C-alpha atoms as one frame of an Amber mdcrd trajectory, in Angstrom:
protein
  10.448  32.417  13.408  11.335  30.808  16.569  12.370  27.459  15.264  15.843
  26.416  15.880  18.209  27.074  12.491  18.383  24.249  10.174  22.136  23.699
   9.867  24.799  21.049   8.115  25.458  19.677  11.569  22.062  18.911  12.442
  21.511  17.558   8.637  24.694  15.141   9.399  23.486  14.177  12.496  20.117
  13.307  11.404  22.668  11.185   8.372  24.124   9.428  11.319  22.391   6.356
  10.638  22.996   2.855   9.040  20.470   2.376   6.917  18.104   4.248   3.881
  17.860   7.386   4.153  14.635   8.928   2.614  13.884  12.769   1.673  11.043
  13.879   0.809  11.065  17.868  -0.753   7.681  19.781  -0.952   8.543  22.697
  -3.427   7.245  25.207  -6.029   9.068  23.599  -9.169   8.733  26.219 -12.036
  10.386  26.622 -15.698   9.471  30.132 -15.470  12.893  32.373 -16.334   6.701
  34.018  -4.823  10.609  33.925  -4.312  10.775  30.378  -2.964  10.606  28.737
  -6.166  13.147  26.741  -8.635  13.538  25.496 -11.977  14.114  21.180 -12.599
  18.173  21.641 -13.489  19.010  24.235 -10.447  17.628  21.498  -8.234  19.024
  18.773  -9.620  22.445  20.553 -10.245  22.394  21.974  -6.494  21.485  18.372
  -4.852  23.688  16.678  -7.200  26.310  14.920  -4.461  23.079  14.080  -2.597
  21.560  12.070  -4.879  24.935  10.711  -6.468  24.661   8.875  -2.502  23.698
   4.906  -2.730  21.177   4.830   0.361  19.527   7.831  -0.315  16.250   8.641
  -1.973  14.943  12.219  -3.157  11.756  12.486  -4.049   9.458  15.863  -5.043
   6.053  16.463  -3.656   4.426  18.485  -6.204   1.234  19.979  -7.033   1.646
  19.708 -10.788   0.206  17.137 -12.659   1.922  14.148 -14.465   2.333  15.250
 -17.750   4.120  18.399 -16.661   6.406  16.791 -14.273   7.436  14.498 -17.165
   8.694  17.282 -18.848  10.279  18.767 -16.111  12.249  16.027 -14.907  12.282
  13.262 -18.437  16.203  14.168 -18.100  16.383  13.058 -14.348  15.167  10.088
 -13.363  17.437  10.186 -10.188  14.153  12.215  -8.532  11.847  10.570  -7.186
   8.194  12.149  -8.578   4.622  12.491  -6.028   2.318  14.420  -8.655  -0.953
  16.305  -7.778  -0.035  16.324  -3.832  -0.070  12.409  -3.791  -2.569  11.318
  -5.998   0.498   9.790  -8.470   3.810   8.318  -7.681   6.709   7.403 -10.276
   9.472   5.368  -7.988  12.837   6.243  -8.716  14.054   4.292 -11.761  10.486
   3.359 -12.837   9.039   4.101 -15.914   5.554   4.228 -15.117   3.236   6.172
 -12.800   1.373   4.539  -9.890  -1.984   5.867  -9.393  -2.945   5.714  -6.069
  -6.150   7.615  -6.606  -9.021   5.143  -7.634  -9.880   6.101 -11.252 -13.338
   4.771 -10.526 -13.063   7.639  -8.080 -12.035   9.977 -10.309 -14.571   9.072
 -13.205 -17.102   9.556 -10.645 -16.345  12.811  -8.826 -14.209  14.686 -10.773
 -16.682  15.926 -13.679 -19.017  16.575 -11.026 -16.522  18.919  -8.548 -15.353
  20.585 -12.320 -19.092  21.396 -13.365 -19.565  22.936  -9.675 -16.414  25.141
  -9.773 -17.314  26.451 -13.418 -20.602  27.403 -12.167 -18.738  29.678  -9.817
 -16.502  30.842 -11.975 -19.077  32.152 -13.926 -20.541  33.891 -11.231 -17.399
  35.585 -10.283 -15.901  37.471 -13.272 -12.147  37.350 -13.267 -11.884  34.272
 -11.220 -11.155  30.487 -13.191 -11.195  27.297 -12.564  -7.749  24.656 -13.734
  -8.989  21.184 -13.406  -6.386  18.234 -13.024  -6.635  14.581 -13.356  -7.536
  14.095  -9.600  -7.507  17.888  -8.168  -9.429  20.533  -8.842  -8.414  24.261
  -8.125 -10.520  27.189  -8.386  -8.931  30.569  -8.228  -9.675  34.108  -7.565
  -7.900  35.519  -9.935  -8.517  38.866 -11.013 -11.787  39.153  -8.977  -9.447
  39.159  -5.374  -8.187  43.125  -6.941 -11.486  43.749  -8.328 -13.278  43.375
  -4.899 -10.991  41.249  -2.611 -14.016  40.379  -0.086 -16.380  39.446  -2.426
 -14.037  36.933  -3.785 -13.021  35.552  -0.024 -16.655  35.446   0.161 -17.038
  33.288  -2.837 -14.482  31.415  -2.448 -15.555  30.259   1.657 -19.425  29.889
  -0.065 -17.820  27.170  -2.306 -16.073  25.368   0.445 -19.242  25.264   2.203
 -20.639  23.973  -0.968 -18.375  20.964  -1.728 -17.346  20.072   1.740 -21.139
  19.016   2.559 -21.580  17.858  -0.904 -18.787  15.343  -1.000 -17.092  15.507
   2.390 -18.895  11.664   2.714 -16.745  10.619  -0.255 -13.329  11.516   1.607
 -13.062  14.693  -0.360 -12.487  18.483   0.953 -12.026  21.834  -0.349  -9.228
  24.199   1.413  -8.458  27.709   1.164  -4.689  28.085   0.375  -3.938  31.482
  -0.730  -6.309  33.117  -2.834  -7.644  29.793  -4.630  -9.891  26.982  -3.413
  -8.252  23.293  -3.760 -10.375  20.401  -4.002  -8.655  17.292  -3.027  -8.836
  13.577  -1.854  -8.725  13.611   1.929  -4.705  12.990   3.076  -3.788  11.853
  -0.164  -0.374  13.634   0.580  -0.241  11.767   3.711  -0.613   8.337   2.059
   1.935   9.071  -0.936   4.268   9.355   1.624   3.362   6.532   3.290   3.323
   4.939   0.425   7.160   5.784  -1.400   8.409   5.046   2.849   6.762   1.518
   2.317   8.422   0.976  -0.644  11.871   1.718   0.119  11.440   0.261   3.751
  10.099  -2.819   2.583  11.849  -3.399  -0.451   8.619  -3.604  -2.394   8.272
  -3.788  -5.958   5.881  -1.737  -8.016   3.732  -4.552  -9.508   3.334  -5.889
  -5.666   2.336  -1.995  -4.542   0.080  -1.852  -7.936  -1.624  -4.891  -6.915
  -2.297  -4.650  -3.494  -3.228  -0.567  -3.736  -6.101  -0.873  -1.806  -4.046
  -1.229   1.412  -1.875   2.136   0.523  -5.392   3.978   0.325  -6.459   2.466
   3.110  -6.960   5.659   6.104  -3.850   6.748   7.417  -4.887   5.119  11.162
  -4.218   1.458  10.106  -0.249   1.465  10.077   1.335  -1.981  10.502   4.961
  -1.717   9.213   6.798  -5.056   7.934   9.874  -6.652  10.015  11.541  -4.361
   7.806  13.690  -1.237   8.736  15.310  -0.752   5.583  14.910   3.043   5.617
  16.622   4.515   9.390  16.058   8.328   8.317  13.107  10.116   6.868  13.000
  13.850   5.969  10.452  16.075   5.300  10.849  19.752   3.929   7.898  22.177
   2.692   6.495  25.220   3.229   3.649  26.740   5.990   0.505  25.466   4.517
  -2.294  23.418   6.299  -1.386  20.579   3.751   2.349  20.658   4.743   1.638
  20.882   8.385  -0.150  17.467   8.061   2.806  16.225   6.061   5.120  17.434
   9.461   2.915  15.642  11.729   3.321  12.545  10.399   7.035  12.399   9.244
   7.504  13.541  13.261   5.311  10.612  14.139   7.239   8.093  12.500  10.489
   9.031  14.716   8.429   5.624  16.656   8.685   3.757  13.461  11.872   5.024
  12.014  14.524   6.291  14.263  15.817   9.070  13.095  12.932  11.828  11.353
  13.375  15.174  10.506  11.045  18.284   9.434  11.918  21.660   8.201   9.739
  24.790   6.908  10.752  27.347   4.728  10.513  30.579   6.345  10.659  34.275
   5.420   9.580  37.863   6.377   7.596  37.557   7.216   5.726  34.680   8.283
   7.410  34.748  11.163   4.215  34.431  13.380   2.660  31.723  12.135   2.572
  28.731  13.735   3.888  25.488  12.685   5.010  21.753  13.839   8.523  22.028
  11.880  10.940  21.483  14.132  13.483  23.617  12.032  13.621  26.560   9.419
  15.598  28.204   6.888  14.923  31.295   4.915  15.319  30.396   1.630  15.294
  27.530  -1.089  19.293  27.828  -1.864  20.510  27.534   1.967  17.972  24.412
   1.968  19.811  22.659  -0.950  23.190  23.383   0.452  22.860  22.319   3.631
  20.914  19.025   1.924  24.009  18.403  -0.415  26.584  18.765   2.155
């Protein structure tokens, strides 16, 4: 609520580079005929000069899994795709997904972090559990009306639960909302490390394939190649825990970069909370515009 205004002029002048120009959107994509949400065509349609640009790369940061984002977005390939916060990455123009989660990982944890959410869920009538290919999400559901601090109480018990269960594996659970989200530790944080590499460095996805161990590597080792292909990096989300990491970092690499950039949606009101965004704006539309100016 006290961030300065996100504006076309301060857009342009973060533009005011020679160079890449990489943009990174963290938003509620729905199909579906919360208020800060949009459908695949309206944000395509209302970004469609700013793609249309030759040194600039969009690309969504989703919580939805593959499969779903290929339908969403299997008529526009000029996005740029980061599926299940980070855990998969289809590069503009590619075909394929990369999986920077380890499927050994997956094999391993995943039926076991399902199996402990069910158990929950069965415990708590009204609540359910969706399980993804590398995130898990248990939600209140109907138990949050039917007795609102039983089901916070739940819900922090089975934080407690798989935080000192698995913590040692690099995985957490998080409150966000009224659901519990079990995911790889800064998995968001690497994805985005991981598309900047790619478009900085000019790398190809066979090279990032092969040598993914270094893009799940924690985010403290950060050596950056004689390259500065990419001179502007932006970052837009929401005010989450997850997307203040996200801010954090893409302000961080205004050592790497040069010119960086964050912005928060905002509303009323969430005015009070606090958040490392250096700029807001108050609604998904006045985002876009500003972005495709």
């Amino acid at each position: 609520g006290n961030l300065v205004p996100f504006t076309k002029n301060a857009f342009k002048d973060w533009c005011s580079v020679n160079g890449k120009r990489l943009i990174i959107l963290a938003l509620e994509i729905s199909s579906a005929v919360k208020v800060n949400v949009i459908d695949p065509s309206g944000l395509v349609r209302l970004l469609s000069d700013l793609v249309e640009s030759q040194d600039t790369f969009v690309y969504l940061l989703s919580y939805l899994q593959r499969s779903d984002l290929d339908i969403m977005f299997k008529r526009y390939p000029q996005i740029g795709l980061i599926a299940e916060n980070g855990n998969f990455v289809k590069l503009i123009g590619a075909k394929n997904w990369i999986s920077l989660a380890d499927k050994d990982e997956l094999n391993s944890w995943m039926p076991e972090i399902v199996k402990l959410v069910e158990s929950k869920v069965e415990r708590l009538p009204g609540s359910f559990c969706e399980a993804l290919d590398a995130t898990v999400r248990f939600h209140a559901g109907k138990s949050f009306s039917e007795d609102r601090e039983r089901s916070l109480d739940t819900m922090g018990e089975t934080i407690q639960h798989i935080n000192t269960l698995f913590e040692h594996n690099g995985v957490h659970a998080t409150l966000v909302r009224n659901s519990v989200i079990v995911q790889k530790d800064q998995i968001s944080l690497k994805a985005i490390r991981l598309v900047l590499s790619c478009h900085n460095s000019n790398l190809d996805q066979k090279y990032v394939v092969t040598h993914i161990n270094e893009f799940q590597q924690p985010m403290k080792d950060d050596i950056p190649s004689n390259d500065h292909e990419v001179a502007a990096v932006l970052y837009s989300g929401g005010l989450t825990s997850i997307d203040e990491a996200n801010y954090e970092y893409v302000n961080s690499l205004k050592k790497d970069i040069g010119n960086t950039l964050t912005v928060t949606l905002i509303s009323s009101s969430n005015e009070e909370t606090k958040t490392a965004a250096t700029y807001g704006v108050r609604g998904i539309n006045e985002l876009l515009c500003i972005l495709n100016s």
